[PDB]
């Protein structure tokens, strides 16, 4: 649900470590990017209408 990421897209928002912390957190230069590649949790189904950069692409 999160295999092509968008860096250049992210805009450091706070959408993503709220949602859950398996792959949507941030890191410490900023760049919010996913940390979870095959995030199954049930919290990406909502992050892809949260995440604005719709960075977490889901390429499932
Ligand atoms: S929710 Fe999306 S746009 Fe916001 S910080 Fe996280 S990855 Fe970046």
Redesign the pocket.
Known sequence: MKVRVDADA???????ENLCPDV?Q?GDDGK??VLQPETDLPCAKDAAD????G?ISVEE
């Open positions: 992210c805009i450091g928002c706070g959408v993503c949507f941030l919010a990017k949260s995440c604005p950069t960075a």
